[PDB]
Design a protein around this ligand. Structure first.
Ligand SMILES: Nc1ncnc2c1ncn2[C@@H]1O[C@H](CSCC[C@H](N)C(=O)O)[C@@H](O)[C@H]1O
Length: 215
C-alpha cells in the first residue's frame, strides 16, 4: 500500500527522468493520485508498470506515459474549464482536477463505467470531477465552451461539436485514424488564425462510439 505507493514514486521518477513529465503541475498530480486508485484489485500490482490495464466493460486505463503526454500537451492552468471525453476509470479526470483546482466535466457512454469511475473518485476523496453518462462525441453543451477538450477514445475524424465547444485559443487533444483501434494523436488548436494541427505520432485507444464518432 505504502509498497504500492513506493513503486509508483519510481514510475513518476522515471517519467520525469525520461522527459515525459516535464512540469511540476503534472508531477504533483501524478504523485497525488497514483494509478492503483483507479483499477480493480487484481490489477493494482501492475498499476506502476508503464502499460495500459483493463477496466470493466472491455475498456482500458491508459498507460501512464500516454496520460502524462496528453496532460503536458494540454498545458493546464488553475481555473481552466476542461471536458474529458471517455472517463473510463476516472484517473485522468482526477489528475486534471488536481491541476485546474475547479470543476472538471467528463463524459462516459457505458453506465457500468460511469459507476466505476464515480466510486473510484469518491474513495480517493475527489469532489470536483463530474462524471456524465452520454455520447461525448457530442461534447457537453451545458458547460461549454472549454479551454481544453481531452478525448481518450479514438475517432474516425475530428468531431465538429468538439471544435464548436472550444474557446478560441483552446485546444482539442484527440486520437484520429481510419482504424477503430489504431490512431494518430492530434493536437487541434482552435487559433485566431484557424485550425492548426500538430500530429503527435501513433497511438492505440479504444474507439469513440457515437454520433460524431464510430457507429
Ligand atoms: N462517445 C463516447 N462518449 C463517452 N465515452 C466514450 C465514448 N466512446 C467511448 N467512450 C469511452 O471512452 C473510454 C476511454 S477509457 C481511457 C481511460 C480513461 N480516460 C481513464 O482515465 O481511465 C472508455 O471507457 C469508453 O467506454
Amino acid at each position: 500500500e505504502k509498497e504500492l505507493y513506493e513503486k509508483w514514486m519510481r514510475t513518476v521518477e522515471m517519467l520525469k527522468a525520461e522527459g515525459i513529465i516535464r512540469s511540476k503541475e503534472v508531477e504533483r498530480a501524478f504523485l497525488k493520485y497514483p494509478r492503483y486508485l483507479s483499477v480493480e484489485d487484481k490489477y493494482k500490482k501492475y498499476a506502476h508498470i508503464d502499460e495500459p490495464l483493463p477496466i470493466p466493460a472491455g475498456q482500458t486505463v491508459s498507460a501512464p506515459h500516454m496520460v502524462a503526454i496528453m496532460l503536458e500537451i494540454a498545458n493546464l492552468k488553475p481555473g481552466m474549464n476542461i471536458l474529458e471525453v471517455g472517463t473510463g476509470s476516472g484517473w485522468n479526470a482526477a489528475l486534471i482536477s488536481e491541476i485546474v483546482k475547479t470543476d472538471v466535466y467528463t463524459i462516459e457512454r457505458i453506465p457500468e463505467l460511469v459507476e466505476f469511475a464515480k466510486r473510484n473518485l469518491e474513495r480517493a476523496g475527489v469532489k470536483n470531477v463530474h462524471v456524465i453518462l452520454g455520447d461525448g462525441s457530442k461534447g457537453f453543451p451545458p458547460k461549454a465552451p472549454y479551454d481544453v477538450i481531452i478525448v481518450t477514445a479514438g475517432a474516425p475524424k475530428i468531431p465538429e461539436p468538439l471544435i464548436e465547444q472550444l474557446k478560441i485559443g483552446g485546444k482539442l487533444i484527440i486520437p484520429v485514424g481510419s482504424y477503430h483501434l489504431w490512431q494518430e494523436l492530434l493536437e487541434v488548436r482552435k487559433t485566431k488564425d484557424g485550425i492548426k494541427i500538430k500530429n503527435h505520432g501513433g497511438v492505440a485507444f479504444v474507439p469513440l462510439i457515437g454520433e460524431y464518432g464510430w457507429k
